mmCIF file of all heavy atoms in Angstrom:
data_model
loop_
_atom_site.group_PDB
_atom_site.id
_atom_site.type_symbol
_atom_site.label_atom_id
_atom_site.label_comp_id
_atom_site.label_asym_id
_atom_site.label_seq_id
_atom_site.Cartn_x
_atom_site.Cartn_y
_atom_site.Cartn_z
ATOM 1 N N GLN A 1 -16.165 -1.174 -1.664
ATOM 2 C CA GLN A 1 -15.537 -2.322 -1.020
ATOM 3 C C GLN A 1 -14.144 -1.974 -0.506
ATOM 4 O O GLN A 1 -13.144 -2.213 -1.182
ATOM 5 C CB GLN A 1 -15.459 -3.503 -1.989
ATOM 6 C CG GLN A 1 -15.562 -3.112 -3.454
ATOM 7 C CD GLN A 1 -15.693 -4.313 -4.370
ATOM 8 O OE1 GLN A 1 -14.745 -5.076 -4.552
ATOM 9 N NE2 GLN A 1 -16.873 -4.486 -4.954
ATOM 10 N N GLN A 2 -14.087 -1.409 0.696
ATOM 11 C CA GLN A 2 -12.817 -1.030 1.304
ATOM 12 C C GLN A 2 -11.679 -1.905 0.787
ATOM 13 O O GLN A 2 -11.868 -3.090 0.518
ATOM 14 C CB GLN A 2 -12.901 -1.125 2.829
ATOM 15 C CG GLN A 2 -14.280 -0.822 3.394
ATOM 16 C CD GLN A 2 -14.221 -0.225 4.786
ATOM 17 O OE1 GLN A 2 -13.140 0.002 5.330
ATOM 18 N NE2 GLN A 2 -15.386 0.031 5.370
ATOM 19 N N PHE A 3 -10.498 -1.311 0.650
ATOM 20 C CA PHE A 3 -9.344 -2.026 0.165
ATOM 21 C C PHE A 3 -9.244 -3.297 0.986
ATOM 22 O O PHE A 3 -9.866 -3.449 2.047
ATOM 23 C CB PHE A 3 -8.056 -1.197 0.228
ATOM 24 C CG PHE A 3 -7.527 -1.045 1.607
ATOM 25 C CD1 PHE A 3 -6.946 -2.119 2.266
ATOM 26 C CD2 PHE A 3 -7.649 0.151 2.267
ATOM 27 C CE1 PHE A 3 -6.500 -2.002 3.558
ATOM 28 C CE2 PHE A 3 -7.201 0.277 3.555
ATOM 29 C CZ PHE A 3 -6.630 -0.807 4.208
ATOM 30 N N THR A 4 -8.426 -4.201 0.482
ATOM 31 C CA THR A 4 -8.387 -5.555 0.981
ATOM 32 C C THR A 4 -6.945 -5.907 1.373
ATOM 33 O O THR A 4 -6.005 -5.166 1.045
ATOM 34 C CB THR A 4 -8.907 -6.476 -0.109
ATOM 35 O OG1 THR A 4 -7.823 -6.948 -0.926
ATOM 36 C CG2 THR A 4 -9.952 -5.740 -0.971
ATOM 37 N N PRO A 5 -6.757 -7.010 2.104
ATOM 38 C CA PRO A 5 -5.405 -7.285 2.589
ATOM 39 C C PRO A 5 -4.508 -8.010 1.578
ATOM 40 O O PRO A 5 -3.299 -8.084 1.845
ATOM 41 C CB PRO A 5 -5.652 -8.154 3.822
ATOM 42 C CG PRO A 5 -7.135 -8.113 4.051
ATOM 43 C CD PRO A 5 -7.746 -7.882 2.740
ATOM 44 N N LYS A 6 -5.068 -8.530 0.476
ATOM 45 C CA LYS A 6 -4.245 -8.973 -0.657
ATOM 46 C C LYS A 6 -3.743 -7.714 -1.368
ATOM 47 O O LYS A 6 -2.683 -7.726 -2.001
ATOM 48 C CB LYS A 6 -5.002 -9.898 -1.628
ATOM 49 C CG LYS A 6 -4.142 -10.544 -2.737
ATOM 50 C CD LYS A 6 -4.973 -11.341 -3.789
ATOM 51 C CE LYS A 6 -4.310 -12.682 -4.243
ATOM 52 N NZ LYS A 6 -5.190 -13.635 -5.043
ATOM 53 N N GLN A 7 -4.491 -6.619 -1.228
ATOM 54 C CA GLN A 7 -4.112 -5.364 -1.867
ATOM 55 C C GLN A 7 -2.957 -4.693 -1.142
ATOM 56 O O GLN A 7 -1.940 -4.380 -1.764
ATOM 57 C CB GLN A 7 -5.299 -4.417 -2.022
ATOM 58 C CG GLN A 7 -6.150 -4.697 -3.260
ATOM 59 C CD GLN A 7 -7.397 -3.813 -3.337
ATOM 60 O OE1 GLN A 7 -7.991 -3.466 -2.313
ATOM 61 N NE2 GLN A 7 -7.791 -3.444 -4.552
ATOM 62 N N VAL A 8 -3.089 -4.474 0.160
ATOM 63 C CA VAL A 8 -1.952 -3.949 0.901
ATOM 64 C C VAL A 8 -0.784 -4.898 0.762
ATOM 65 O O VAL A 8 0.367 -4.484 0.909
ATOM 66 C CB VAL A 8 -2.239 -3.811 2.363
ATOM 67 C CG1 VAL A 8 -3.729 -3.997 2.618
ATOM 68 C CG2 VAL A 8 -1.436 -4.827 3.128
ATOM 69 N N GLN A 9 -1.087 -6.169 0.482
ATOM 70 C CA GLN A 9 -0.077 -7.218 0.371
ATOM 71 C C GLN A 9 0.734 -7.057 -0.895
ATOM 72 O O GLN A 9 1.960 -7.071 -0.856
ATOM 73 C CB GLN A 9 -0.724 -8.609 0.388
ATOM 74 C CG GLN A 9 0.237 -9.757 0.123
ATOM 75 C CD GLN A 9 1.401 -9.767 1.105
ATOM 76 O OE1 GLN A 9 1.279 -9.273 2.235
ATOM 77 N NE2 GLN A 9 2.547 -10.321 0.679
ATOM 78 N N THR A 10 0.031 -6.923 -2.014
ATOM 79 C CA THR A 10 0.647 -6.666 -3.307
ATOM 80 C C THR A 10 1.547 -5.454 -3.219
ATOM 81 O O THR A 10 2.631 -5.431 -3.787
ATOM 82 C CB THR A 10 -0.403 -6.370 -4.391
ATOM 83 O OG1 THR A 10 -1.186 -7.549 -4.671
ATOM 84 C CG2 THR A 10 0.283 -5.873 -5.666
ATOM 85 N N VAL A 11 1.092 -4.437 -2.510
ATOM 86 C CA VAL A 11 1.905 -3.251 -2.329
ATOM 87 C C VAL A 11 3.151 -3.551 -1.478
ATOM 88 O O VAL A 11 4.227 -3.007 -1.721
ATOM 89 C CB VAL A 11 1.095 -2.118 -1.699
ATOM 90 C CG1 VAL A 11 2.012 -1.025 -1.175
ATOM 91 C CG2 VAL A 11 0.101 -1.579 -2.714
ATOM 92 N N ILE A 12 3.013 -4.413 -0.480
ATOM 93 C CA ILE A 12 4.158 -4.753 0.357
ATOM 94 C C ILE A 12 5.235 -5.483 -0.464
ATOM 95 O O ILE A 12 6.419 -5.422 -0.138
ATOM 96 C CB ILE A 12 3.712 -5.528 1.633
ATOM 97 C CG1 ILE A 12 3.351 -4.527 2.727
ATOM 98 C CG2 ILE A 12 4.794 -6.447 2.131
ATOM 99 C CD1 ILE A 12 2.752 -5.127 3.972
ATOM 100 N N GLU A 13 4.834 -6.140 -1.551
ATOM 101 C CA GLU A 13 5.796 -6.879 -2.357
ATOM 102 C C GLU A 13 6.410 -6.018 -3.450
ATOM 103 O O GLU A 13 7.604 -6.114 -3.688
ATOM 104 C CB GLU A 13 5.202 -8.174 -2.917
ATOM 105 C CG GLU A 13 4.372 -8.049 -4.190
ATOM 106 C CD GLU A 13 3.418 -9.239 -4.370
ATOM 107 O OE1 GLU A 13 3.199 -9.976 -3.374
ATOM 108 O OE2 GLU A 13 2.889 -9.439 -5.496
ATOM 109 N N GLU A 14 5.627 -5.168 -4.075
ATOM 110 C CA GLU A 14 6.170 -4.297 -5.088
ATOM 111 C C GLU A 14 7.182 -3.364 -4.478
ATOM 112 O O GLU A 14 8.125 -2.955 -5.127
ATOM 113 C CB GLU A 14 5.087 -3.549 -5.836
ATOM 114 C CG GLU A 14 4.514 -4.330 -6.985
ATOM 115 C CD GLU A 14 5.518 -4.600 -8.070
ATOM 116 O OE1 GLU A 14 6.153 -3.644 -8.516
ATOM 117 O OE2 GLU A 14 5.670 -5.761 -8.494
ATOM 118 N N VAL A 15 6.992 -2.985 -3.231
ATOM 119 C CA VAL A 15 7.968 -2.097 -2.639
ATOM 120 C C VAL A 15 9.339 -2.714 -2.465
ATOM 121 O O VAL A 15 10.340 -2.190 -2.918
ATOM 122 C CB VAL A 15 7.555 -1.754 -1.232
ATOM 123 C CG1 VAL A 15 8.660 -2.147 -0.297
ATOM 124 C CG2 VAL A 15 7.260 -0.306 -1.097
ATOM 125 N N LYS A 16 9.372 -3.883 -1.870
ATOM 126 C CA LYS A 16 10.636 -4.485 -1.579
ATOM 127 C C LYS A 16 11.206 -4.720 -2.923
ATOM 128 O O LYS A 16 12.347 -4.450 -3.215
ATOM 129 C CB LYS A 16 10.420 -5.802 -0.865
ATOM 130 C CG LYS A 16 9.897 -5.640 0.535
ATOM 131 C CD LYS A 16 9.307 -6.925 1.050
ATOM 132 C CE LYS A 16 10.303 -7.700 1.888
ATOM 133 N NZ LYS A 16 9.919 -9.134 2.041
ATOM 134 N N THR A 17 10.325 -5.144 -3.787
ATOM 135 C CA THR A 17 10.718 -5.661 -5.044
ATOM 136 C C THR A 17 11.422 -4.491 -5.638
ATOM 137 O O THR A 17 12.127 -4.619 -6.611
ATOM 138 C CB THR A 17 9.506 -6.028 -5.880
ATOM 139 O OG1 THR A 17 9.154 -7.393 -5.634
ATOM 140 C CG2 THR A 17 9.811 -5.870 -7.339
ATOM 141 N N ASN A 18 11.161 -3.307 -5.132
ATOM 142 C CA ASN A 18 11.887 -2.193 -5.683
ATOM 143 C C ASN A 18 12.541 -1.279 -4.710
ATOM 144 O O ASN A 18 13.020 -0.216 -5.062
ATOM 145 C CB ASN A 18 11.037 -1.497 -6.697
ATOM 146 C CG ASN A 18 10.416 -2.468 -7.616
ATOM 147 O OD1 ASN A 18 11.103 -3.292 -8.192
ATOM 148 N ND2 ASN A 18 9.106 -2.441 -7.710
ATOM 149 N N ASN A 19 12.592 -1.696 -3.466
ATOM 150 C CA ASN A 19 13.383 -0.914 -2.569
ATOM 151 C C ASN A 19 12.966 0.516 -2.752
ATOM 152 O O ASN A 19 13.722 1.295 -3.282
ATOM 153 C CB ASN A 19 14.853 -1.076 -2.897
ATOM 154 C CG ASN A 19 15.377 -2.434 -2.541
ATOM 155 O OD1 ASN A 19 15.849 -2.653 -1.441
ATOM 156 N ND2 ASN A 19 15.305 -3.350 -3.468
ATOM 157 N N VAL A 20 11.719 0.830 -2.445
ATOM 158 C CA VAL A 20 11.234 2.211 -2.533
ATOM 159 C C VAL A 20 11.323 2.889 -1.174
ATOM 160 O O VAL A 20 10.766 2.401 -0.197
ATOM 161 C CB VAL A 20 9.805 2.311 -3.067
ATOM 162 C CG1 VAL A 20 9.361 3.747 -3.041
ATOM 163 C CG2 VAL A 20 9.742 1.787 -4.482
ATOM 164 N N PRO A 21 12.047 4.015 -1.103
ATOM 165 C CA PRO A 21 12.311 4.639 0.201
ATOM 166 C C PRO A 21 11.087 5.301 0.892
ATOM 167 O O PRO A 21 10.940 5.134 2.113
ATOM 168 C CB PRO A 21 13.435 5.643 -0.112
ATOM 169 C CG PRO A 21 13.329 5.918 -1.570
ATOM 170 C CD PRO A 21 12.782 4.671 -2.202
ATOM 171 N N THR A 22 10.232 6.009 0.146
ATOM 172 C CA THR A 22 9.059 6.664 0.745
ATOM 173 C C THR A 22 7.705 6.343 0.071
ATOM 174 O O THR A 22 7.573 6.340 -1.169
ATOM 175 C CB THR A 22 9.230 8.188 0.817
ATOM 176 O OG1 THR A 22 10.477 8.518 1.450
ATOM 177 C CG2 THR A 22 8.097 8.784 1.612
ATOM 178 N N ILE A 23 6.698 6.090 0.907
ATOM 179 C CA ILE A 23 5.357 5.745 0.427
ATOM 180 C C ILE A 23 4.281 6.695 0.956
ATOM 181 O O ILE A 23 4.315 7.089 2.125
ATOM 182 C CB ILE A 23 5.009 4.305 0.813
ATOM 183 C CG1 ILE A 23 4.817 4.193 2.322
ATOM 184 C CG2 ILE A 23 6.109 3.345 0.357
ATOM 185 C CD1 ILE A 23 4.565 2.750 2.788
ATOM 186 N N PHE A 24 3.322 7.041 0.094
ATOM 187 C CA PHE A 24 2.362 8.100 0.395
ATOM 188 C C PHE A 24 0.922 7.692 0.331
ATOM 189 O O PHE A 24 0.563 6.777 -0.398
ATOM 190 C CB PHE A 24 2.530 9.248 -0.586
ATOM 191 C CG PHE A 24 3.910 9.743 -0.661
ATOM 192 C CD1 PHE A 24 4.677 9.501 -1.781
ATOM 193 C CD2 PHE A 24 4.469 10.406 0.409
ATOM 194 C CE1 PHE A 24 5.971 9.942 -1.848
ATOM 195 C CE2 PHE A 24 5.757 10.850 0.355
ATOM 196 C CZ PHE A 24 6.512 10.620 -0.781
ATOM 197 N N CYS A 25 0.100 8.431 1.073
ATOM 198 C CA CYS A 25 -1.354 8.321 1.017
ATOM 199 C C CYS A 25 -1.917 9.622 0.471
ATOM 200 O O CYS A 25 -1.164 10.495 0.024
ATOM 201 C CB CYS A 25 -1.931 8.067 2.409
ATOM 202 S SG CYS A 25 -3.300 6.919 2.435
ATOM 203 N N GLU A 26 -3.242 9.754 0.504
ATOM 204 C CA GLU A 26 -3.874 11.016 0.152
ATOM 205 C C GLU A 26 -4.777 11.444 1.270
ATOM 206 O O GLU A 26 -5.160 10.637 2.128
ATOM 207 C CB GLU A 26 -4.669 10.927 -1.151
ATOM 208 C CG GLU A 26 -3.832 10.587 -2.356
ATOM 209 C CD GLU A 26 -3.459 9.139 -2.372
ATOM 210 O OE1 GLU A 26 -4.361 8.304 -2.196
ATOM 211 O OE2 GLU A 26 -2.269 8.835 -2.537
ATOM 212 N N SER A 27 -5.152 12.714 1.226
ATOM 213 C CA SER A 27 -5.828 13.332 2.348
ATOM 214 C C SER A 27 -7.300 12.988 2.488
ATOM 215 O O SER A 27 -7.921 13.425 3.431
ATOM 216 C CB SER A 27 -5.666 14.848 2.278
ATOM 217 O OG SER A 27 -6.441 15.412 1.229
ATOM 218 N N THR A 28 -7.862 12.215 1.563
ATOM 219 C CA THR A 28 -9.307 11.894 1.602
ATOM 220 C C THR A 28 -9.669 10.422 1.960
ATOM 221 O O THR A 28 -10.851 10.098 2.131
ATOM 222 C CB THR A 28 -10.014 12.319 0.285
ATOM 223 O OG1 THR A 28 -9.399 11.669 -0.835
ATOM 224 C CG2 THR A 28 -9.899 13.810 0.088
ATOM 225 N N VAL A 29 -8.649 9.561 2.096
ATOM 226 C CA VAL A 29 -8.830 8.131 2.288
ATOM 227 C C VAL A 29 -8.120 7.666 3.543
ATOM 228 O O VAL A 29 -7.645 8.493 4.325
ATOM 229 C CB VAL A 29 -8.273 7.354 1.092
ATOM 230 C CG1 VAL A 29 -8.952 7.822 -0.174
ATOM 231 C CG2 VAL A 29 -6.775 7.568 0.983
ATOM 232 N N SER A 30 -8.022 6.341 3.693
ATOM 233 C CA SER A 30 -7.553 5.643 4.903
ATOM 234 C C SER A 30 -6.031 5.449 4.946
ATOM 235 O O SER A 30 -5.454 4.780 4.091
ATOM 236 C CB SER A 30 -8.266 4.276 4.980
ATOM 237 O OG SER A 30 -7.793 3.461 6.031
ATOM 238 N N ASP A 31 -5.368 6.015 5.943
ATOM 239 C CA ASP A 31 -3.915 5.827 6.050
ATOM 240 C C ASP A 31 -3.569 4.446 6.610
ATOM 241 O O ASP A 31 -2.465 3.957 6.438
ATOM 242 C CB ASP A 31 -3.262 6.944 6.886
ATOM 243 C CG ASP A 31 -3.775 6.978 8.333
ATOM 244 O OD1 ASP A 31 -4.835 6.369 8.631
ATOM 245 O OD2 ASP A 31 -3.121 7.631 9.179
ATOM 246 N N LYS A 32 -4.537 3.825 7.264
ATOM 247 C CA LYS A 32 -4.339 2.545 7.949
ATOM 248 C C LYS A 32 -3.710 1.418 7.120
ATOM 249 O O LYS A 32 -2.897 0.636 7.623
ATOM 250 C CB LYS A 32 -5.663 2.079 8.544
ATOM 251 C CG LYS A 32 -6.290 3.106 9.481
ATOM 252 C CD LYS A 32 -7.590 2.580 10.072
ATOM 253 C CE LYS A 32 -8.582 2.126 8.977
ATOM 254 N NZ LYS A 32 -9.894 1.592 9.513
ATOM 255 N N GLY A 33 -4.085 1.324 5.852
ATOM 256 C CA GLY A 33 -3.520 0.303 4.995
ATOM 257 C C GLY A 33 -2.095 0.609 4.582
ATOM 258 O O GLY A 33 -1.267 -0.300 4.487
ATOM 259 N N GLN A 34 -1.808 1.888 4.319
ATOM 260 C CA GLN A 34 -0.481 2.314 3.857
ATOM 261 C C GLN A 34 0.536 2.267 4.974
ATOM 262 O O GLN A 34 1.632 1.720 4.816
ATOM 263 C CB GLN A 34 -0.523 3.739 3.338
ATOM 264 C CG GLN A 34 0.702 4.109 2.551
ATOM 265 C CD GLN A 34 0.713 3.475 1.180
ATOM 266 O OE1 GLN A 34 0.686 4.171 0.168
ATOM 267 N NE2 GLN A 34 0.746 2.144 1.134
#
């Protein structure tokens, strides 16, 4: 079940919530969500 937009959403909040400067993907999956 491909990742979901509440999922990319949760990630969008944890980041701000922590002011994280760089975010990464992996070489076998979808960069589109990240």
Side-chain angles (χ1 to χ4, degrees):
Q1 21 189 290
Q2 328 210 2
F3 74 72
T4 92
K6 188 187 220 168
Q7 277 175 326
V8 349
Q9 174 57 26
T10 292
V11 165
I12 273 173
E13 83 201 16
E14 275 295 308
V15 123
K16 290 163 96 198
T17 269
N18 313 308
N19 289 270
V20 176
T22 308
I23 69 184
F24 307 109
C25 219
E26 298 76 49
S27 72
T28 58
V29 303
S30 174
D31 62 344
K32 304 181 306 180
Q34 194 74 117

